[PDB]
Assembly symmetry: T
Amino acid sequence: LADSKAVLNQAVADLSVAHSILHQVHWYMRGRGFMIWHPKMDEYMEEIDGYLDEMSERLITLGGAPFSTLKEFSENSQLKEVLGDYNVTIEEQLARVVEVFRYLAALFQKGFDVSDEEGDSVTNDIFNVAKASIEKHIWMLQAELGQAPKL
Amino acid sequence: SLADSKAVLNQAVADLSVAHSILHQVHWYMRGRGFMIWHPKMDEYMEEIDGYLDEMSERLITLGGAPFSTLKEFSENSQLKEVLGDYNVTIEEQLARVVEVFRYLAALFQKGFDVSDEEGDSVTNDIFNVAKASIEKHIWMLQAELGQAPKL
Amino acid sequence: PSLADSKAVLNQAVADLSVAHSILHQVHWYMRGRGFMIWHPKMDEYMEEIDGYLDEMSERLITLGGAPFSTLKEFSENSQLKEVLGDYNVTIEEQLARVVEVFRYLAALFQKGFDVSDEEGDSVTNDIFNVAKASIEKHIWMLQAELGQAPKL
Amino acid sequence: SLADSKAVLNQAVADLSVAHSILHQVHWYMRGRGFMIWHPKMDEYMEEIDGYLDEMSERLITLGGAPFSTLKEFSENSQLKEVLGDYNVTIEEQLARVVEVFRYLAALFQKGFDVSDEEGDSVTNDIFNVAKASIEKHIWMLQAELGQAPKL
Amino acid sequence: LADSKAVLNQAVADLSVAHSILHQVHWYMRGRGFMIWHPKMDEYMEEIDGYLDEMSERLITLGGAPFSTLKEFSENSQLKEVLGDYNVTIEEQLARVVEVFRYLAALFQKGFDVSDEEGDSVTNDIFNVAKASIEKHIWMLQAELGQAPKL
Amino acid sequence: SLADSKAVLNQAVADLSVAHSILHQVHWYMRGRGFMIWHPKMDEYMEEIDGYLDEMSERLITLGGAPFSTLKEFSENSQLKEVLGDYNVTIEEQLARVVEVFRYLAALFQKGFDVSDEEGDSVTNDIFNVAKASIEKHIWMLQAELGQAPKL
Amino acid sequence: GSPAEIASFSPRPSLADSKAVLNQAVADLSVAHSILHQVHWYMRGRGFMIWHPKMDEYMEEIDGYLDEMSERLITLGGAPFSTLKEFSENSQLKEVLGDYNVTIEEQLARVVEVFRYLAALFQKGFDVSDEEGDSVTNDIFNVAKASIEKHIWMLQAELGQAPKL
Amino acid sequence: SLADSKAVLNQAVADLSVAHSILHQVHWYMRGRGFMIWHPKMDEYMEEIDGYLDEMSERLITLGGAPFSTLKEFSENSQLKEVLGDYNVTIEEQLARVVEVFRYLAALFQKGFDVSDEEGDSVTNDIFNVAKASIEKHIWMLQAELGQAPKL
Amino acid sequence: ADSKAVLNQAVADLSVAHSILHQVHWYMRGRGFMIWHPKMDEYMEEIDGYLDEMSERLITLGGAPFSTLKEFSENSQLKEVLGDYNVTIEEQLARVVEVFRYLAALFQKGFDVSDEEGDSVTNDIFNVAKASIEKHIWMLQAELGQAPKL
Amino acid sequence: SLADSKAVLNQAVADLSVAHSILHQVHWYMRGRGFMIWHPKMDEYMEEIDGYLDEMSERLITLGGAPFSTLKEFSENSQLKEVLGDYNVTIEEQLARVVEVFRYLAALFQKGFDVSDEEGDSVTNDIFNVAKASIEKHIWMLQAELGQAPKL
Amino acid sequence: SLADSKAVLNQAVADLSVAHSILHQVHWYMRGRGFMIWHPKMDEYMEEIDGYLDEMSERLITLGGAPFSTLKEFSENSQLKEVLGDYNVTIEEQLARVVEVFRYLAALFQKGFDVSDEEGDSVTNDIFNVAKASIEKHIWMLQAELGQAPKL
Amino acid sequence: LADSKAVLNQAVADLSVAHSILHQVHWYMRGRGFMIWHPKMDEYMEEIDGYLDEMSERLITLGGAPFSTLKEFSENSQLKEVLGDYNVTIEEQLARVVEVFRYLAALFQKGFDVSDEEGDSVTNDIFNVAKASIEKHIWMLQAELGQAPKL
Ligand SMILES: [Ca+2]
Ligand SMILES: [Ca+2]
Ligand SMILES: [Ca+2]
Ligand SMILES: [Ca+2]
Ligand SMILES: [Cl-]
Ligand SMILES: [Cl-]
Ligand SMILES: [Zn+2]
Ligand SMILES: [Zn+2]
Ligand SMILES: [Zn+2]
Ligand SMILES: [Zn+2]
Ligand SMILES: [Zn+2]
Ligand SMILES: [Zn+2]
Ligand SMILES: [Zn+2]
Ligand SMILES: [Zn+2]
Ligand SMILES: [Zn+2]
Ligand SMILES: [Zn+2]
Ligand SMILES: [Zn+2]
Ligand SMILES: [Zn+2]
Ligand SMILES: [Zn+2]
Ligand SMILES: [Zn+2]
Ligand SMILES: [Zn+2]
Ligand SMILES: [Zn+2]
Ligand SMILES: [Zn+2]
Ligand SMILES: [Zn+2]
Ligand SMILES: [Zn+2]
Ligand SMILES: [Zn+2]
Ligand SMILES: [Zn+2]
Ligand SMILES: [Zn+2]
Ligand SMILES: [Zn+2]
Ligand SMILES: [Zn+2]
């Protein structure tokens, strides 16, 4: 199950980075819509952390060894972090979250595919449930930004 | 016989069923700034609409009537017109649609209040009164969001 | 697109779930006979569940870039379920049979939903149909048991 | 000035006390299919009845009155008749008895509604209206179990 | 009171009248302490109603036929009711509740003895549980009244 | 028009604000046996009063009115008079003051009820009726604590 | 040499002491649970929607007694039966294969039969515990006997009968 | 001794009373996009303000003081100025006015902290500190909504 | 041969697994009792959860679940032994892991059989149960200082 | 008449007071593997003990007695002995100390049961029985954690 | 380094233990009007005292100290004096006794605050400030019940 | 670190790294006591995350710009991470936790002093509350390890 394991570990790195980005958005947001979106980041972070612990623990259960240091997360993740900046608009912050979410849904499709190929049906459901929710969020986020989900 | 109390309860069943459909369409097709507050707010409105619908229908049953209970009956008896879902409608326009729907229901509930008062059906009268109070409060709030007075 | 039929079955479900709700509510209202006190509130539970599937399936369709049916005309014209005027003289067991018939239809609709979404690689939609089908079938067993019959799925 | 309102509230106190007693008798003496549903349903009914009793008695106190407050006063002033407990009454018959008590109560509440309106006691008028709404809903549901229209 | 069923029915009657007396106190009470003791009667009434239902249903379980009319309760009960009087003092009202509770405690002891003698151990426990609570209440009401429980 | 309803709603906003102030003084300056029960009771009464205040004000807004919304407006339009806090007042005197305030409120709510009934503003009418009912129940209880009949 | 190993029919099943009745109850409660669960699954007919969930409530109550009586045996120094083999062999209740074609009336009459048996067993446990002076175990049997008897009344009432204890 | 800790506590009582009044005005008179989020948000702030008011007042009582307890006393002693309510004002102006009242309270709570530190009144010191911490958090968030730095 | 057969097998095996977990709950002695005694309650509630769900899926599918102790004991692959207080905590946990290993294996078989037969509902039931039991093996093994070794 | 029952109730008050003290010592002085489970567990034990203490003392009051109510009285009448706290005692020694306390309490509650039974004090009898049941369950569990039989 | 902060924490342990014992005596021996409010109120006070007790003792453990943990140590180190329970004491004298205990604890907590402030133990300092704040508020309330100023 | 803003940001870095370390322990833990200490790491992480958010938001409130990327956390933190190892014993993992907590308490002491020096009472209290809780944990962890707190 080398590929299932590998994608689970890739997920651990990327979710760790995704959390960090969402927290930056939580903190640096400024503009109309702050009062609704600030707490919404909290909800997203909670959901992301849930996936991260569950995917990492599935890897452990499969006899893997999850990335568990900031260096490992940073060097393995495909997500790039930029310095926090208050001058970003609310709408650009939300577009950043959509971008991160689009990537996560892409990674979870990969994890679904790989685990399906290897017969790891339990890991397959983990990725399917995560992808379901993340795609729902992409619809809602895109809707707030006056756009179709464009999955 | 409470003929008109019964007639107006059934009108309300039809119109509430269509009102719910319109709110659920707004819920789904909404796009633009404010989606995150207004999307779940439609859920709140739909629950309330739904509560009135079941109470009014069951008051009509209680009074010996026969509530409308098919979509055909709802469509053909409602005064509310439905249009196809369109994502290009703005938030402010979507909210305006909801206000128009609520103004109608508020007027309908007024008519039900008046009719039940005259027939001496005080229980029905109270059902309409409570529904109207809440709906008019929603109108104030929606209109305030839209930068406007309630204009009741 | 590659999900054209996934979308088609999601929309079908929206229309049929809307009509199925209408029917359950009719049963809630027009019910008369021994067992009213149990089954009357049970219809509320079914409607609640049905409404949950309705919102979720329509919203998945939106998420896939579709346009859900959202008028009573569209529900009525697209649904394969047929409505009749409410009648207090239908027996409790006839009303329960009617609900069973509706649930059999939805289980089959969800089966096709599963198969179509499965073939298009839309696994999220696949799971939505799968969860709904499971509960609907459990309901069929219970309703049939009340009626003194096997599930006969 | 509020002598009639006061008298009808005290009538309600007596009648509700006796209605409570009849419902508790049904609760205990019930036998036949449906017991498991209707036994606890009688507790729901008794709680509701007890709520009206305390509200109506305390409204009378509030208006400067003196509520009946002994079993003899309840029994002698109530229009409802009690009968000895009997396990051989059928479920259908027991539910029919509750319907009878509830119809009487719905009619008492209409009277109380009427009298309180005539004397300009709008608080008492509301108390009777709310209670009537709920009792009448119960008659619908009970009659339905019995395969009948509410026949209000 | 020949047996356990006889005492159970006696308690059904007395608990019904006890309830009525407590309800009278709830309504007719005036004086300093009203705000505490008004709601407290509700608590006592709920407890009394609990024993009432438990004891009656025990009698049914044993093959009896509980009293179930106001006439039966009033005639079989050893408690006496008087017309409501607002001019009774709050301390007199509490003293009246104590009187009722002392009677009930004594009835429950008689129920305990009879059921013990007959070997009706379920009924025995019912009376013992009820006696315990009533006696604790007598202590507390007596204390409010500046008196020893005097059981 | 609905001018008198709008006027009595606004009077209530002023008078509720001053009543709140008076109850908070009582909560704070209270001394004597009974403090431990009446001190928190004042919180409860304040929560109820603030509930009516917000509801009546927002009803006024909904009707196209403009509620009083400054302490100057409350003080100047209210019929209730305030005095400096004084720890030397007895519990009896504090509770009697609450009763007087409550009596005033019950009377204003009866005026609101009459005016709204005249103008056909049924929603406003019920708001006043609900409030009057609760306030009158409180006057019974306070008066009972003080060893007296409600004497409404 | 070594000590000879006894070969005997290890008969027991003489409800002599509290420990013995506690273990018997352990056995009977396990089988009662099994019967209740069969009624739960195989039930058909008008009343299913009320009685299907009700069996769950009864099962939970029975398991509560099972655990508490078993743990009381442990506390007193005993060794509770803890195998389906031990339960089936020591229990005086009889199990039959599941059958969908039993009326609700027949189902509830079966439950009554098991409950009557349990109440009688708990009465035995009560009497034994009392002669021994085991007042804690005595209480356990009394509490369980009380509620089982209440259920008998109710089930019998659904069936249009007196409790007939 | 406690002389100016008592003084600043009473100042806070007046200012919090007025701040409460302003927040309630904003709640009622707000119109424009953001209404549906900011309207209930004002209730949150009012509950919080009210908490400080009661705690600070009761600390003053505890210290042997006599808190201000009439609208006249609040109005005359508060440094905050009230204006007549106006629906036309924009949401962003409304939020800016709240920020203005909060900045004042934070500066008042600092003076409270300062004077209670020197005088040795450690309990009053912590009350002001906790309140200041939360008001400063609100300034950040309100300013953030308004597209600005906190600028404390 | 089918989903119905694996479902019934699970009914039998879950019944016996419950009994084993209850024996551990009762006979457990040694350091850790205070945490592992109640944990067995958690495991039993979970097991009983699957038991009822799988049994009722069987009924829904037109089957007839095993419903006597004799049917459970005979059809089950798990072997019960007599309760003994002298087993250590670490040995009792080792026993639970073996039972859970067996269950995870059965659930894989159920997953496979239902996948072939195109019975996605039953497939999902087995997939959900397997996920949880495997997670428990990880934790139990970790308490026993070992890898999951699935 | 109930002198023995009163006597044992009061003995229990003293002993439960000292037992609480010993348990709290264990809570504070525990060091070693198992701390994180056993530390909060002593809180569970203390709350249970405190419950018996208050119930038995109040039963004594109810019966006309005068419960020990000072540390001097508790210490002088308790048969349980206290030693100075020592972090150097092992977890397993601490648990053994808890077991010995509970064995004593179990024995005392049996003496209570026996005395109250002889005297016909069934309420006091039931209090000791219920307490003994729970303590004995704890002895089993504590012994199981120490790898031993309950050995009552 | 922190020997004086440790000493005062440990003094608190003894004093809080004796304070608990006094409150429990009051809880049990109380007779007179007000019993039904004050009896349970003693439970709330005991719960609060026990909170400080465990918190202060555990802070002492955390700082490397060894808390008093025996009735002998509590008794011998506490500055509070206990007397035998007396039913013949009035409610008002019982409450006055509680006030004395509380004035003592508030002085103790003031010492604790000052000592810990001098030694730069900011955590222990906050523990004392919080405890003092609450005990002082209770002194106000108890004194108000007794018709007096707090007189801190 | 010269001012309150500087130490608040130091804490943001260090709390982020401390989270990572606790999460490492949660995952790699093996040995008797796992079942207690595994969920305990969750409680610690929840608490750590609380300080992280409060301290960062206080920095924003004061007009600062908190670190908000893994790069900033890892480079600015004085805590060091190692690769996850299943072979570390329970007691060694708990000792790792203790040492992280000891550092954190020392940082919050420094934050207390710096903010007290600058008259920033609000920040002072934040550090004070955090240190109180961390010190209590050190005592309990040390107790589990058979040792004195040794602050
Ligand atoms: Ca007409
Ligand atoms: Ca019919
Ligand atoms: Ca019959
Ligand atoms: Ca404008
Ligand atoms: Cl605007
Ligand atoms: Cl050691
Ligand atoms: Zn974060
Ligand atoms: Zn985890
Ligand atoms: Zn809808
Ligand atoms: Zn309905
Ligand atoms: Zn509907
Ligand atoms: Zn939705
Ligand atoms: Zn009754
Ligand atoms: Zn009442
Ligand atoms: Zn009553
Ligand atoms: Zn009952
Ligand atoms: Zn106020
Ligand atoms: Zn409002
Ligand atoms: Zn089962
Ligand atoms: Zn157990
Ligand atoms: Zn306000
Ligand atoms: Zn207050
Ligand atoms: Zn079991
Ligand atoms: Zn089931
Ligand atoms: Zn203690
Ligand atoms: Zn007590
Ligand atoms: Zn105590
Ligand atoms: Zn502690
Ligand atoms: Zn983490
Ligand atoms: Zn935050």
